[PDB]
Write a protein that holds these residues in place. Structure first.
Motif, PDB file in Angstrom:
ATOM      1  N   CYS A   8     -33.855  -8.050  28.939  1.00  0.00           N
ATOM      2  CA  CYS A   8     -33.713  -7.313  27.638  1.00  0.00           C
ATOM      3  C   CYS A   8     -33.104  -8.177  26.532  1.00  0.00           C
ATOM      4  N   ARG A  10     -30.404  -7.466  23.013  1.00  0.00           N
ATOM      5  CA  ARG A  10     -29.614  -6.483  22.203  1.00  0.00           C
ATOM      6  C   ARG A  10     -29.996  -6.578  20.711  1.00  0.00           C
ATOM      7  N   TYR A  13     -34.300  -4.653  22.080  1.00  0.00           N
ATOM      8  CA  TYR A  13     -34.191  -3.461  22.973  1.00  0.00           C
ATOM      9  C   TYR A  13     -35.609  -3.225  23.493  1.00  0.00           C
ATOM     10  N   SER A  19     -31.712   0.580  26.650  1.00  0.00           N
ATOM     11  CA  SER A  19     -31.274  -0.444  25.676  1.00  0.00           C
ATOM     12  C   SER A  19     -30.892  -1.696  26.467  1.00  0.00           C
ATOM     13  N   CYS A  20     -30.501  -2.742  25.778  1.00  0.00           N
ATOM     14  CA  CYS A  20     -30.125  -3.977  26.506  1.00  0.00           C
ATOM     15  C   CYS A  20     -28.653  -3.911  26.904  1.00  0.00           C
ATOM     16  N   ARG A  21     -28.363  -4.560  28.000  1.00  0.00           N
ATOM     17  CA  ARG A  21     -26.976  -4.599  28.541  1.00  0.00           C
ATOM     18  C   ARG A  21     -26.687  -6.037  28.992  1.00  0.00           C
ATOM     19  N   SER A  22     -26.325  -6.833  28.019  1.00  0.00           N
ATOM     20  CA  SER A  22     -25.988  -8.278  28.238  1.00  0.00           C
ATOM     21  C   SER A  22     -27.170  -9.059  28.832  1.00  0.00           C
TER      22      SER A  22
END
Length: 25
Positions: A8, A10, A13, A19-22
């Motif tokens: 992903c 941030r 997205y 959504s993105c998570r790191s």
């Protein structure tokens, strides 16, 4: 986009399932 826990961004997205998570959805 992509599945959760996948690659992903941030700023895009590119997460179909969220959504993105790191860098990981």
């Amino acid at each position: 986009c992509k599945g959760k826990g996948a690659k992903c961004s941030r700023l895009m997205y590119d997460c179909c399932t969220g959504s993105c998570r790191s860098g990981k959805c």
